[PDB]
Amino acid sequence: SEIIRVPDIGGDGEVIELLVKTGDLIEVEQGLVVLESAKASMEVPSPKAGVVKSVSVKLGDKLKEGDAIIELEPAAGAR
């Protein structure tokens, strides 16, 4: 699995709402979270089609770029 931290926003990223859960399988397109900026709010979908494994963040919490956000587990066959 790979950890997905905050991308390059150019400022601080405050979590507004969370439309995901643990064990939920996302897709390459569906949104994932809604962070707000100092001049515009941006959303971040799932960067990989996997199943949420653990949430290292919360709703309303603040995070600075470079900080880990969540850990998706893209079962690449494994079996």
PDB file of N, CA, C and O in Angstrom:
ATOM      1  N   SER A   1       0.861  -1.217   0.000  1.00  0.00           N
ATOM      2  CA  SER A   1       0.000   0.000   0.000  1.00  0.00           C
ATOM      3  C   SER A   1       0.884   1.249   0.000  1.00  0.00           C
ATOM      4  O   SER A   1       2.060   1.189   0.298  1.00  0.00           O
ATOM      5  N   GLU A   2       0.326   2.381  -0.334  1.00  0.00           N
ATOM      6  CA  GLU A   2       1.135   3.633  -0.352  1.00  0.00           C
ATOM      7  C   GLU A   2       0.409   4.721   0.441  1.00  0.00           C
ATOM      8  O   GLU A   2      -0.804   4.773   0.474  1.00  0.00           O
ATOM      9  N   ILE A   3       1.143   5.591   1.080  1.00  0.00           N
ATOM     10  CA  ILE A   3       0.493   6.675   1.870  1.00  0.00           C
ATOM     11  C   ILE A   3       0.262   7.892   0.972  1.00  0.00           C
ATOM     12  O   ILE A   3       1.084   8.229   0.143  1.00  0.00           O
ATOM     13  N   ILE A   4      -0.851   8.555   1.130  1.00  0.00           N
ATOM     14  CA  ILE A   4      -1.134   9.748   0.284  1.00  0.00           C
ATOM     15  C   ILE A   4      -1.140  11.004   1.159  1.00  0.00           C
ATOM     16  O   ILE A   4      -2.078  11.259   1.889  1.00  0.00           O
ATOM     17  N   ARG A   5      -0.102  11.791   1.092  1.00  0.00           N
ATOM     18  CA  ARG A   5      -0.049  13.029   1.920  1.00  0.00           C
ATOM     19  C   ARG A   5      -0.642  14.196   1.128  1.00  0.00           C
ATOM     20  O   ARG A   5      -1.066  14.042  -0.001  1.00  0.00           O
ATOM     21  N   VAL A   6      -0.677  15.363   1.711  1.00  0.00           N
ATOM     22  CA  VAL A   6      -1.244  16.538   0.992  1.00  0.00           C
ATOM     23  C   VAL A   6      -0.352  16.880  -0.205  1.00  0.00           C
ATOM     24  O   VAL A   6       0.859  16.832  -0.109  1.00  0.00           O
ATOM     25  N   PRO A   7      -0.982  17.216  -1.300  1.00  0.00           N
ATOM     26  CA  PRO A   7      -0.280  17.575  -2.544  1.00  0.00           C
ATOM     27  C   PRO A   7       0.254  19.008  -2.462  1.00  0.00           C
ATOM     28  O   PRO A   7       0.235  19.629  -1.418  1.00  0.00           O
ATOM     29  N   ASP A   8       0.728  19.537  -3.557  1.00  0.00           N
ATOM     30  CA  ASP A   8       1.262  20.929  -3.542  1.00  0.00           C
ATOM     31  C   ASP A   8       0.104  21.918  -3.692  1.00  0.00           C
ATOM     32  O   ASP A   8      -0.484  22.045  -4.747  1.00  0.00           O
ATOM     33  N   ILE A   9      -0.227  22.621  -2.643  1.00  0.00           N
ATOM     34  CA  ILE A   9      -1.348  23.600  -2.727  1.00  0.00           C
ATOM     35  C   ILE A   9      -0.782  25.022  -2.711  1.00  0.00           C
ATOM     36  O   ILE A   9      -1.347  25.931  -3.285  1.00  0.00           O
ATOM     37  N   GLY A  10       0.329  25.221  -2.056  1.00  0.00           N
ATOM     38  CA  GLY A  10       0.930  26.584  -2.005  1.00  0.00           C
ATOM     39  C   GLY A  10       0.520  27.275  -0.703  1.00  0.00           C
ATOM     40  O   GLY A  10       0.730  28.457  -0.524  1.00  0.00           O
ATOM     41  N   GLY A  11      -0.063  26.545   0.209  1.00  0.00           N
ATOM     42  CA  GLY A  11      -0.485  27.162   1.499  1.00  0.00           C
ATOM     43  C   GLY A  11      -0.927  26.065   2.469  1.00  0.00           C
ATOM     44  O   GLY A  11      -0.471  24.940   2.399  1.00  0.00           O
ATOM     45  N   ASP A  12      -1.811  26.382   3.375  1.00  0.00           N
ATOM     46  CA  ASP A  12      -2.280  25.357   4.349  1.00  0.00           C
ATOM     47  C   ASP A  12      -3.549  24.690   3.815  1.00  0.00           C
ATOM     48  O   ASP A  12      -4.319  25.288   3.091  1.00  0.00           O
ATOM     49  N   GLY A  13      -3.773  23.453   4.167  1.00  0.00           N
ATOM     50  CA  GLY A  13      -4.993  22.749   3.679  1.00  0.00           C
ATOM     51  C   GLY A  13      -5.873  22.365   4.869  1.00  0.00           C
ATOM     52  O   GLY A  13      -5.509  21.536   5.680  1.00  0.00           O
ATOM     53  N   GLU A  14      -7.028  22.961   4.982  1.00  0.00           N
ATOM     54  CA  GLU A  14      -7.929  22.629   6.121  1.00  0.00           C
ATOM     55  C   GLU A  14      -9.005  21.648   5.650  1.00  0.00           C
ATOM     56  O   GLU A  14      -9.685  21.880   4.670  1.00  0.00           O
ATOM     57  N   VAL A  15      -9.166  20.553   6.341  1.00  0.00           N
ATOM     58  CA  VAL A  15     -10.198  19.559   5.932  1.00  0.00           C
ATOM     59  C   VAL A  15     -11.592  20.129   6.206  1.00  0.00           C
ATOM     60  O   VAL A  15     -11.869  20.630   7.278  1.00  0.00           O
ATOM     61  N   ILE A  16     -12.472  20.056   5.245  1.00  0.00           N
ATOM     62  CA  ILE A  16     -13.846  20.594   5.452  1.00  0.00           C
ATOM     63  C   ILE A  16     -14.811  19.437   5.723  1.00  0.00           C
ATOM     64  O   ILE A  16     -15.537  19.437   6.696  1.00  0.00           O
ATOM     65  N   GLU A  17     -14.825  18.451   4.868  1.00  0.00           N
ATOM     66  CA  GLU A  17     -15.743  17.297   5.078  1.00  0.00           C
ATOM     67  C   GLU A  17     -15.073  16.014   4.578  1.00  0.00           C
ATOM     68  O   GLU A  17     -14.102  16.054   3.850  1.00  0.00           O
ATOM     69  N   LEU A  18     -15.585  14.878   4.966  1.00  0.00           N
ATOM     70  CA  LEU A  18     -14.976  13.595   4.514  1.00  0.00           C
ATOM     71  C   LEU A  18     -16.057  12.710   3.889  1.00  0.00           C
ATOM     72  O   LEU A  18     -16.977  12.275   4.553  1.00  0.00           O
ATOM     73  N   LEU A  19     -15.954  12.441   2.615  1.00  0.00           N
ATOM     74  CA  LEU A  19     -16.976  11.585   1.951  1.00  0.00           C
ATOM     75  C   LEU A  19     -16.407  10.180   1.744  1.00  0.00           C
ATOM     76  O   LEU A  19     -16.672   9.533   0.749  1.00  0.00           O
ATOM     77  N   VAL A  20     -15.629   9.701   2.675  1.00  0.00           N
ATOM     78  CA  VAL A  20     -15.046   8.338   2.531  1.00  0.00           C
ATOM     79  C   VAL A  20     -15.104   7.613   3.877  1.00  0.00           C
ATOM     80  O   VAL A  20     -15.443   8.192   4.890  1.00  0.00           O
ATOM     81  N   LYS A  21     -14.778   6.350   3.895  1.00  0.00           N
ATOM     82  CA  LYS A  21     -14.816   5.590   5.177  1.00  0.00           C
ATOM     83  C   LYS A  21     -13.709   4.533   5.177  1.00  0.00           C
ATOM     84  O   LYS A  21     -12.996   4.368   4.207  1.00  0.00           O
ATOM     85  N   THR A  22     -13.560   3.816   6.257  1.00  0.00           N
ATOM     86  CA  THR A  22     -12.499   2.772   6.317  1.00  0.00           C
ATOM     87  C   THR A  22     -13.027   1.473   5.705  1.00  0.00           C
ATOM     88  O   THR A  22     -14.130   1.048   5.984  1.00  0.00           O
ATOM     89  N   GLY A  23     -12.247   0.839   4.873  1.00  0.00           N
ATOM     90  CA  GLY A  23     -12.705  -0.432   4.244  1.00  0.00           C
ATOM     91  C   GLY A  23     -13.541  -0.119   3.002  1.00  0.00           C
ATOM     92  O   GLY A  23     -13.984  -1.006   2.300  1.00  0.00           O
ATOM     93  N   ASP A  24     -13.762   1.137   2.725  1.00  0.00           N
ATOM     94  CA  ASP A  24     -14.569   1.505   1.528  1.00  0.00           C
ATOM     95  C   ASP A  24     -13.666   1.543   0.295  1.00  0.00           C
ATOM     96  O   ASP A  24     -12.607   2.138   0.307  1.00  0.00           O
ATOM     97  N   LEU A  25     -14.077   0.914  -0.773  1.00  0.00           N
ATOM     98  CA  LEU A  25     -13.241   0.915  -2.006  1.00  0.00           C
ATOM     99  C   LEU A  25     -13.571   2.152  -2.844  1.00  0.00           C
ATOM    100  O   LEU A  25     -14.700   2.362  -3.239  1.00  0.00           O
ATOM    101  N   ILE A  26     -12.594   2.974  -3.118  1.00  0.00           N
ATOM    102  CA  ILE A  26     -12.851   4.194  -3.928  1.00  0.00           C
ATOM    103  C   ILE A  26     -12.557   3.897  -5.400  1.00  0.00           C
ATOM    104  O   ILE A  26     -12.337   2.766  -5.783  1.00  0.00           O
ATOM    105  N   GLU A  27     -12.551   4.905  -6.228  1.00  0.00           N
ATOM    106  CA  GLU A  27     -12.269   4.680  -7.673  1.00  0.00           C
ATOM    107  C   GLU A  27     -11.398   5.820  -8.207  1.00  0.00           C
ATOM    108  O   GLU A  27     -11.213   6.829  -7.556  1.00  0.00           O
ATOM    109  N   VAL A  28     -10.862   5.667  -9.386  1.00  0.00           N
ATOM    110  CA  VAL A  28     -10.003   6.742  -9.959  1.00  0.00           C
ATOM    111  C   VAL A  28     -10.889   7.845 -10.542  1.00  0.00           C
ATOM    112  O   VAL A  28     -11.059   7.949 -11.741  1.00  0.00           O
ATOM    113  N   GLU A  29     -11.453   8.671  -9.704  1.00  0.00           N
ATOM    114  CA  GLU A  29     -12.326   9.767 -10.206  1.00  0.00           C
ATOM    115  C   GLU A  29     -13.205  10.282  -9.066  1.00  0.00           C
ATOM    116  O   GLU A  29     -13.314  11.470  -8.840  1.00  0.00           O
ATOM    117  N   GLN A  30     -13.836   9.396  -8.344  1.00  0.00           N
ATOM    118  CA  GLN A  30     -14.708   9.836  -7.218  1.00  0.00           C
ATOM    119  C   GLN A  30     -13.916  10.760  -6.291  1.00  0.00           C
ATOM    120  O   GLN A  30     -12.728  10.593  -6.097  1.00  0.00           O
ATOM    121  N   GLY A  31     -14.564  11.737  -5.717  1.00  0.00           N
ATOM    122  CA  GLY A  31     -13.847  12.671  -4.804  1.00  0.00           C
ATOM    123  C   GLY A  31     -13.432  11.927  -3.533  1.00  0.00           C
ATOM    124  O   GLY A  31     -13.873  10.825  -3.276  1.00  0.00           O
ATOM    125  N   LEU A  32     -12.586  12.521  -2.737  1.00  0.00           N
ATOM    126  CA  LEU A  32     -12.143  11.848  -1.484  1.00  0.00           C
ATOM    127  C   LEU A  32     -12.334  12.797  -0.299  1.00  0.00           C
ATOM    128  O   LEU A  32     -12.881  12.427   0.722  1.00  0.00           O
ATOM    129  N   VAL A  33     -11.889  14.016  -0.425  1.00  0.00           N
ATOM    130  CA  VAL A  33     -12.045  14.986   0.695  1.00  0.00           C
ATOM    131  C   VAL A  33     -12.276  16.388   0.129  1.00  0.00           C
ATOM    132  O   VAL A  33     -12.157  16.616  -1.059  1.00  0.00           O
ATOM    133  N   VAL A  34     -12.607  17.330   0.969  1.00  0.00           N
ATOM    134  CA  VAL A  34     -12.844  18.716   0.478  1.00  0.00           C
ATOM    135  C   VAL A  34     -12.011  19.700   1.303  1.00  0.00           C
ATOM    136  O   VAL A  34     -12.439  20.174   2.337  1.00  0.00           O
ATOM    137  N   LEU A  35     -10.826  20.009   0.856  1.00  0.00           N
ATOM    138  CA  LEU A  35      -9.967  20.961   1.616  1.00  0.00           C
ATOM    139  C   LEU A  35     -10.240  22.388   1.135  1.00  0.00           C
ATOM    140  O   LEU A  35     -10.526  22.619  -0.023  1.00  0.00           O
ATOM    141  N   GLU A  36     -10.153  23.347   2.016  1.00  0.00           N
ATOM    142  CA  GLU A  36     -10.407  24.758   1.608  1.00  0.00           C
ATOM    143  C   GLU A  36      -9.087  25.533   1.603  1.00  0.00           C
ATOM    144  O   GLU A  36      -8.219  25.303   2.421  1.00  0.00           O
ATOM    145  N   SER A  37      -8.931  26.450   0.688  1.00  0.00           N
ATOM    146  CA  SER A  37      -7.667  27.238   0.633  1.00  0.00           C
ATOM    147  C   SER A  37      -7.926  28.653   1.154  1.00  0.00           C
ATOM    148  O   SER A  37      -8.997  28.959   1.640  1.00  0.00           O
ATOM    149  N   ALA A  38      -6.953  29.517   1.061  1.00  0.00           N
ATOM    150  CA  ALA A  38      -7.144  30.910   1.553  1.00  0.00           C
ATOM    151  C   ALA A  38      -7.800  31.758   0.460  1.00  0.00           C
ATOM    152  O   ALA A  38      -8.122  32.911   0.667  1.00  0.00           O
ATOM    153  N   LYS A  39      -8.000  31.198  -0.703  1.00  0.00           N
ATOM    154  CA  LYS A  39      -8.635  31.977  -1.803  1.00  0.00           C
ATOM    155  C   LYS A  39      -9.416  31.034  -2.719  1.00  0.00           C
ATOM    156  O   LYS A  39      -9.703  31.355  -3.855  1.00  0.00           O
ATOM    157  N   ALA A  40      -9.765  29.872  -2.237  1.00  0.00           N
ATOM    158  CA  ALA A  40     -10.529  28.914  -3.085  1.00  0.00           C
ATOM    159  C   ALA A  40     -10.466  27.517  -2.465  1.00  0.00           C
ATOM    160  O   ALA A  40      -9.431  27.079  -2.003  1.00  0.00           O
ATOM    161  N   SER A  41     -11.565  26.814  -2.451  1.00  0.00           N
ATOM    162  CA  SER A  41     -11.566  25.446  -1.861  1.00  0.00           C
ATOM    163  C   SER A  41     -11.366  24.412  -2.971  1.00  0.00           C
ATOM    164  O   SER A  41     -11.995  24.471  -4.008  1.00  0.00           O
ATOM    165  N   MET A  42     -10.493  23.464  -2.760  1.00  0.00           N
ATOM    166  CA  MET A  42     -10.254  22.428  -3.804  1.00  0.00           C
ATOM    167  C   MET A  42     -10.634  21.052  -3.254  1.00  0.00           C
ATOM    168  O   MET A  42     -10.661  20.836  -2.059  1.00  0.00           O
ATOM    169  N   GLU A  43     -10.929  20.118  -4.118  1.00  0.00           N
ATOM    170  CA  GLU A  43     -11.308  18.757  -3.643  1.00  0.00           C
ATOM    171  C   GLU A  43     -10.248  17.748  -4.091  1.00  0.00           C
ATOM    172  O   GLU A  43      -9.555  17.954  -5.067  1.00  0.00           O
ATOM    173  N   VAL A  44     -10.117  16.658  -3.384  1.00  0.00           N
ATOM    174  CA  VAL A  44      -9.103  15.637  -3.770  1.00  0.00           C
ATOM    175  C   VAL A  44      -9.761  14.255  -3.805  1.00  0.00           C
ATOM    176  O   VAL A  44     -10.124  13.718  -2.777  1.00  0.00           O
ATOM    177  N   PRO A  45      -9.895  13.720  -4.991  1.00  0.00           N
ATOM    178  CA  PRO A  45     -10.507  12.398  -5.200  1.00  0.00           C
ATOM    179  C   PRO A  45      -9.515  11.287  -4.848  1.00  0.00           C
ATOM    180  O   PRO A  45      -8.478  11.528  -4.262  1.00  0.00           O
ATOM    181  N   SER A  46      -9.827  10.072  -5.202  1.00  0.00           N
ATOM    182  CA  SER A  46      -8.905   8.944  -4.890  1.00  0.00           C
ATOM    183  C   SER A  46      -7.845   8.829  -5.990  1.00  0.00           C
ATOM    184  O   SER A  46      -8.173   8.635  -7.144  1.00  0.00           O
ATOM    185  N   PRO A  47      -6.604   8.951  -5.597  1.00  0.00           N
ATOM    186  CA  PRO A  47      -5.465   8.863  -6.527  1.00  0.00           C
ATOM    187  C   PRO A  47      -5.175   7.401  -6.874  1.00  0.00           C
ATOM    188  O   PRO A  47      -4.279   7.098  -7.636  1.00  0.00           O
ATOM    189  N   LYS A  48      -5.929   6.493  -6.319  1.00  0.00           N
ATOM    190  CA  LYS A  48      -5.702   5.050  -6.613  1.00  0.00           C
ATOM    191  C   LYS A  48      -6.964   4.257  -6.268  1.00  0.00           C
ATOM    192  O   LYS A  48      -7.600   4.494  -5.260  1.00  0.00           O
ATOM    193  N   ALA A  49      -7.331   3.317  -7.095  1.00  0.00           N
ATOM    194  CA  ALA A  49      -8.552   2.511  -6.810  1.00  0.00           C
ATOM    195  C   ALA A  49      -8.216   1.419  -5.793  1.00  0.00           C
ATOM    196  O   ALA A  49      -7.795   0.336  -6.149  1.00  0.00           O
ATOM    197  N   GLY A  50      -8.399   1.693  -4.531  1.00  0.00           N
ATOM    198  CA  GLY A  50      -8.090   0.669  -3.494  1.00  0.00           C
ATOM    199  C   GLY A  50      -9.123   0.751  -2.369  1.00  0.00           C
ATOM    200  O   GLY A  50     -10.169   1.349  -2.517  1.00  0.00           O
ATOM    201  N   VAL A  51      -8.838   0.152  -1.244  1.00  0.00           N
ATOM    202  CA  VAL A  51      -9.805   0.196  -0.112  1.00  0.00           C
ATOM    203  C   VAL A  51      -9.168   0.924   1.075  1.00  0.00           C
ATOM    204  O   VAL A  51      -8.124   0.539   1.563  1.00  0.00           O
ATOM    205  N   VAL A  52      -9.789   1.972   1.543  1.00  0.00           N
ATOM    206  CA  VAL A  52      -9.218   2.722   2.696  1.00  0.00           C
ATOM    207  C   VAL A  52      -8.736   1.733   3.759  1.00  0.00           C
ATOM    208  O   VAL A  52      -9.393   0.755   4.055  1.00  0.00           O
ATOM    209  N   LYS A  53      -7.590   1.979   4.335  1.00  0.00           N
ATOM    210  CA  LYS A  53      -7.067   1.051   5.378  1.00  0.00           C
ATOM    211  C   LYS A  53      -7.037   1.769   6.729  1.00  0.00           C
ATOM    212  O   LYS A  53      -7.375   1.203   7.750  1.00  0.00           O
ATOM    213  N   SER A  54      -6.635   3.010   6.744  1.00  0.00           N
ATOM    214  CA  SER A  54      -6.583   3.762   8.029  1.00  0.00           C
ATOM    215  C   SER A  54      -6.634   5.264   7.744  1.00  0.00           C
ATOM    216  O   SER A  54      -6.091   5.738   6.766  1.00  0.00           O
ATOM    217  N   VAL A  55      -7.282   6.016   8.591  1.00  0.00           N
ATOM    218  CA  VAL A  55      -7.366   7.488   8.367  1.00  0.00           C
ATOM    219  C   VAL A  55      -6.454   8.207   9.361  1.00  0.00           C
ATOM    220  O   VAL A  55      -6.703   8.220  10.551  1.00  0.00           O
ATOM    221  N   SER A  56      -5.397   8.808   8.885  1.00  0.00           N
ATOM    222  CA  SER A  56      -4.470   9.526   9.804  1.00  0.00           C
ATOM    223  C   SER A  56      -4.916  10.983   9.942  1.00  0.00           C
ATOM    224  O   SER A  56      -4.165  11.832  10.379  1.00  0.00           O
ATOM    225  N   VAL A  57      -6.132  11.279   9.574  1.00  0.00           N
ATOM    226  CA  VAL A  57      -6.625  12.681   9.685  1.00  0.00           C
ATOM    227  C   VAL A  57      -8.079  12.675  10.159  1.00  0.00           C
ATOM    228  O   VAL A  57      -8.664  11.634  10.384  1.00  0.00           O
ATOM    229  N   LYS A  58      -8.666  13.830  10.313  1.00  0.00           N
ATOM    230  CA  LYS A  58     -10.082  13.890  10.772  1.00  0.00           C
ATOM    231  C   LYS A  58     -10.811  15.017  10.037  1.00  0.00           C
ATOM    232  O   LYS A  58     -10.218  15.766   9.285  1.00  0.00           O
ATOM    233  N   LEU A  59     -12.092  15.145  10.248  1.00  0.00           N
ATOM    234  CA  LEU A  59     -12.856  16.224   9.561  1.00  0.00           C
ATOM    235  C   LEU A  59     -12.740  17.522  10.363  1.00  0.00           C
ATOM    236  O   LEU A  59     -12.971  17.548  11.556  1.00  0.00           O
ATOM    237  N   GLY A  60     -12.383  18.599   9.719  1.00  0.00           N
ATOM    238  CA  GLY A  60     -12.254  19.893  10.445  1.00  0.00           C
ATOM    239  C   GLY A  60     -10.816  20.058  10.943  1.00  0.00           C
ATOM    240  O   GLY A  60     -10.418  21.121  11.379  1.00  0.00           O
ATOM    241  N   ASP A  61     -10.033  19.017  10.880  1.00  0.00           N
ATOM    242  CA  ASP A  61      -8.623  19.115  11.349  1.00  0.00           C
ATOM    243  C   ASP A  61      -7.795  19.888  10.321  1.00  0.00           C
ATOM    244  O   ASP A  61      -8.145  19.963   9.159  1.00  0.00           O
ATOM    245  N   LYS A  62      -6.700  20.462  10.737  1.00  0.00           N
ATOM    246  CA  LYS A  62      -5.852  21.230   9.782  1.00  0.00           C
ATOM    247  C   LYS A  62      -4.585  20.431   9.470  1.00  0.00           C
ATOM    248  O   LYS A  62      -4.036  19.762  10.322  1.00  0.00           O
ATOM    249  N   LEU A  63      -4.117  20.496   8.253  1.00  0.00           N
ATOM    250  CA  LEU A  63      -2.885  19.741   7.888  1.00  0.00           C
ATOM    251  C   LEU A  63      -2.024  20.591   6.951  1.00  0.00           C
ATOM    252  O   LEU A  63      -2.527  21.290   6.094  1.00  0.00           O
ATOM    253  N   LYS A  64      -0.730  20.536   7.108  1.00  0.00           N
ATOM    254  CA  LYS A  64       0.162  21.341   6.226  1.00  0.00           C
ATOM    255  C   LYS A  64       0.708  20.452   5.106  1.00  0.00           C
ATOM    256  O   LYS A  64       1.035  19.302   5.318  1.00  0.00           O
ATOM    257  N   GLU A  65       0.804  20.977   3.914  1.00  0.00           N
ATOM    258  CA  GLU A  65       1.325  20.166   2.779  1.00  0.00           C
ATOM    259  C   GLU A  65       2.514  19.326   3.251  1.00  0.00           C
ATOM    260  O   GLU A  65       3.346  19.783   4.008  1.00  0.00           O
ATOM    261  N   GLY A  66       2.601  18.102   2.808  1.00  0.00           N
ATOM    262  CA  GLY A  66       3.737  17.234   3.231  1.00  0.00           C
ATOM    263  C   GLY A  66       3.279  16.305   4.356  1.00  0.00           C
ATOM    264  O   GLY A  66       3.929  15.327   4.669  1.00  0.00           O
ATOM    265  N   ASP A  67       2.165  16.600   4.967  1.00  0.00           N
ATOM    266  CA  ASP A  67       1.668  15.732   6.072  1.00  0.00           C
ATOM    267  C   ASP A  67       0.865  14.569   5.485  1.00  0.00           C
ATOM    268  O   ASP A  67       0.115  14.733   4.543  1.00  0.00           O
ATOM    269  N   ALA A  68       1.015  13.395   6.034  1.00  0.00           N
ATOM    270  CA  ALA A  68       0.259  12.224   5.507  1.00  0.00           C
ATOM    271  C   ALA A  68      -1.241  12.464   5.685  1.00  0.00           C
ATOM    272  O   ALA A  68      -1.666  13.150   6.593  1.00  0.00           O
ATOM    273  N   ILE A  69      -2.047  11.904   4.825  1.00  0.00           N
ATOM    274  CA  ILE A  69      -3.519  12.102   4.947  1.00  0.00           C
ATOM    275  C   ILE A  69      -4.189  10.761   5.258  1.00  0.00           C
ATOM    276  O   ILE A  69      -4.738  10.564   6.323  1.00  0.00           O
ATOM    277  N   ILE A  70      -4.150   9.839   4.335  1.00  0.00           N
ATOM    278  CA  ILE A  70      -4.785   8.513   4.580  1.00  0.00           C
ATOM    279  C   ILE A  70      -3.925   7.413   3.956  1.00  0.00           C
ATOM    280  O   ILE A  70      -2.922   7.678   3.322  1.00  0.00           O
ATOM    281  N   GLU A  71      -4.308   6.177   4.128  1.00  0.00           N
ATOM    282  CA  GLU A  71      -3.513   5.061   3.544  1.00  0.00           C
ATOM    283  C   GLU A  71      -4.441   4.127   2.766  1.00  0.00           C
ATOM    284  O   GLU A  71      -5.179   3.351   3.340  1.00  0.00           O
ATOM    285  N   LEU A  72      -4.410   4.193   1.463  1.00  0.00           N
ATOM    286  CA  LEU A  72      -5.291   3.307   0.651  1.00  0.00           C
ATOM    287  C   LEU A  72      -4.557   2.000   0.348  1.00  0.00           C
ATOM    288  O   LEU A  72      -3.361   1.982   0.138  1.00  0.00           O
ATOM    289  N   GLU A  73      -5.265   0.904   0.324  1.00  0.00           N
ATOM    290  CA  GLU A  73      -4.610  -0.401   0.034  1.00  0.00           C
ATOM    291  C   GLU A  73      -5.093  -0.925  -1.321  1.00  0.00           C
ATOM    292  O   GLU A  73      -6.122  -1.567  -1.406  1.00  0.00           O
ATOM    293  N   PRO A  74      -4.331  -0.632  -2.341  1.00  0.00           N
ATOM    294  CA  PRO A  74      -4.644  -1.056  -3.717  1.00  0.00           C
ATOM    295  C   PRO A  74      -4.290  -2.532  -3.915  1.00  0.00           C
ATOM    296  O   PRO A  74      -3.270  -2.864  -4.487  1.00  0.00           O
ATOM    297  N   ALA A  75      -5.123  -3.420  -3.447  1.00  0.00           N
ATOM    298  CA  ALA A  75      -4.834  -4.872  -3.609  1.00  0.00           C
ATOM    299  C   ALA A  75      -4.389  -5.146  -5.047  1.00  0.00           C
ATOM    300  O   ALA A  75      -5.200  -5.279  -5.941  1.00  0.00           O
ATOM    301  N   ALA A  76      -3.108  -5.231  -5.276  1.00  0.00           N
ATOM    302  CA  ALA A  76      -2.615  -5.496  -6.656  1.00  0.00           C
ATOM    303  C   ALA A  76      -2.587  -7.006  -6.906  1.00  0.00           C
ATOM    304  O   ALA A  76      -1.557  -7.576  -7.206  1.00  0.00           O
ATOM    305  N   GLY A  77      -3.711  -7.657  -6.782  1.00  0.00           N
ATOM    306  CA  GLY A  77      -3.749  -9.129  -7.011  1.00  0.00           C
ATOM    307  C   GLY A  77      -3.439  -9.857  -5.703  1.00  0.00           C
ATOM    308  O   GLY A  77      -4.270 -10.556  -5.159  1.00  0.00           O
ATOM    309  N   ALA A  78      -2.249  -9.698  -5.192  1.00  0.00           N
ATOM    310  CA  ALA A  78      -1.887 -10.381  -3.917  1.00  0.00           C
ATOM    311  C   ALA A  78      -2.306 -11.851  -3.990  1.00  0.00           C
ATOM    312  O   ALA A  78      -1.569 -12.693  -4.464  1.00  0.00           O
ATOM    313  N   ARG A  79      -3.482 -12.167  -3.520  1.00  0.00           N
ATOM    314  CA  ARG A  79      -3.945 -13.583  -3.562  1.00  0.00           C
ATOM    315  C   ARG A  79      -2.884 -14.484  -2.927  1.00  0.00           C
ATOM    316  O   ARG A  79      -2.015 -14.944  -3.649  1.00  0.00           O
TER     317      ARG A  79
END
